[PDB]
Amino acid sequence: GSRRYDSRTTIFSPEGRLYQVEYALESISHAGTAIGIMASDGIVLAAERKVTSTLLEQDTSTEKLYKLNDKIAVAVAGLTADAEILINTARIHAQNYLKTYNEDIPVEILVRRLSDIKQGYTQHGGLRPFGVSFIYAGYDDRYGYQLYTSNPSGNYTGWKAISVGANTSAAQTLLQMDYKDDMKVDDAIELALKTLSKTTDSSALTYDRLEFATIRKGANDGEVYQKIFKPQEIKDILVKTGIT
Amino acid sequence: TSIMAVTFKDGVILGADSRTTTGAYIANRVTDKLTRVHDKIWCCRSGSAADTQAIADIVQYHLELYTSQYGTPSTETAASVFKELCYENKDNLTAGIIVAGYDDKNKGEVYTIPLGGSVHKLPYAIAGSGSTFIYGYCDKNFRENMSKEETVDFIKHSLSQAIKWDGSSGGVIRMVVLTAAGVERLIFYPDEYEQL
């Protein structure tokens, strides 16, 4: 019957571990690198694509930066296919909360909601877990700027600066020596590019293989404007900060 | 509306009028009330225009499927499918239907299904609105096993009277002659049948 062909993707191992969730972590270590830095007055999200040929039109392309409403953007690392599914369930839950309380969703709710969806598949169902890891950059008046990473376990914790994707270890050690608490949005940009410049597989770092988006409070009246940079602002900011 | 079917020596003959009213206003003076639900089993419709048209498309679908699997239906059989759509839904549909068929093993047969939902094998039937006014005229004049010339004249005199006294009937009298020959339509114009 059906039992013969069954993988069983929800059992414990002989040592009290979940093999299948471990392996989801492994496939996230091949995908492109993504970094987020938290300054006093904004957040930088900066991600390196896995594609780079010139026939590909990377200019209009967005596969790393998504807006969830008008205050919370996420970056993706993992299966880009899988990630679009969780993003529409998040987009919808972010909006339901605005419908029922006429007040923009706290960052803490929208992150805790996505985590439990992922948790859900390893608890029951027998479906294979999700193969995605998010960095949430968002702004709320309660704590100011906030940064959160969640992985395919569903455990999320806040951060001051974090990185998922290739060489997670190497990227964290470069940031750790340089980061300071008095950073402004100008200072953070310069540390983000430089850290991707030291880890990239290819020695050259180009404007076309980088995606980049910030959230700054320099929008008037105590508000926040999310901009996902055009390819012509990235190009100018790579010559300004002296990476090329 | 005023329909009828008269079995005769070779098969069976159906006849109906072509009027469809919505109160005093006449919507259609030329409408076919004799529908083919198979190539040897026709039916005549009276009652609510919609209710019976819904039954006639659904019976046409049940009998096509019957043919592709089990072989040619009988007239008996076709009558029993109407029976199951009328009786089950008799709280929603108003359906007065005559089913008239020609087998090659039993000649012409007539089953009539009045508003209730029962079958009745009769040697000739009348139904509709204008039927009331000719029950007496037909019972005097119907002999069994008449010749095809005589039977067409017997159906025309009938509905002639049904048209003259009823206000819901009128226009052309169509006819379907349903025999071993096949399907032969006649039509009788208002000039012709108002003298006889």
Binding site: T214, G218, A219, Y225 | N28, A49, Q53, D57
Partner: protein
């Protein structure tokens, strides 16, 4: 409302008035009343105006899909048989009255379909409040076999007569001619009976006539740049 459908030799011509009403008050002086189901199958709707709009769009999609799936041009009787079934399932709540006209590889057809799912054939048809005023004109001049210039005149006369003699109809006559083996011709505003005669005066007020309490500006553009 007045709607006529007149079959002739090589096609069918279907024409309507343009006045759309909301009780005694004319809602729109000029409005679309001929709906397109597919490139060859036009229909017109009387009765409740929200019901015909919604039903033609629903039978539009289901026949557009069906068209791409079989790779044939749609036959008129498809549009008739999907309407019949969908208007019955509701037991006659939906108050849609349509004249579905169209051409196809079988020939031209012209049907009428009422709110209960009852359907008929015809060579002339009418619908709406002033339907009886159109039927008198059809009966008077309709003869079997007409030419395209002739049939178009007969169709617009009937709507012409429905405008003067029924209150529900007014303004323009729209005609729509579909010939066998040709592109459908939608001839918009084909007869204009009467335009609004001038006013006696103008009424431009001098600036400063209204009294204004306060003023503000409402930023509609997205949150302004960084």
């Amino acid at each position: 409302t007045t709607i006529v459908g007149v079959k002739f030799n090589n096609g069918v011509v279907i024409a309507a008035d343009t006045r759309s009403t909301q009780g005694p008050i004319v809602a729109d002086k000029n409005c679309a009343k001929l709906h397109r189901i597919s490139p060859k199958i036009w229909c017109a709707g009387a009765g409740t105006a929200a019901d015909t709009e919604a039903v033609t769009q629903l039978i539009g999609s289901n026949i557009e899909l069906h068209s791409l799936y079989t790779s044939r041009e749609p036959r008129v009787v498809s549009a008739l048989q999907m309407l019949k079934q969908h208007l019955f399932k509701y037991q006659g709540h939906i108050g849609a009255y349509l004249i579905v006209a169209g051409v196809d590889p079988t020939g031209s057809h012209l049907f009428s379909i009422h709110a209960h799912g009852s359907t008929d054939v015809g060579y002339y048809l009418s619908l709406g409040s002033g339907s009886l005023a159109a039927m008198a004109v059809l009966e008077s001049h309709w003869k079997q076999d007409l030419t395209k210039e002739e049939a178009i005149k007969l169709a617009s006369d009937a709507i012409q007569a429905g405008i003067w003699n029924d209150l529900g109809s007014g303004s323009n006559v729209d005609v729509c001619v579909m010939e066998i083996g040709k592109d459908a011709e939608y001839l918009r505003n084909y007869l204009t009976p009467n335009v609004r005669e001038e006013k006696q005066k103008s009424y431009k007020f001098p600036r400063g006539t209204t009294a204004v309490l306060k003023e503000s500006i409402v930023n509609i553009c997205d949150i302004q740049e960084e």
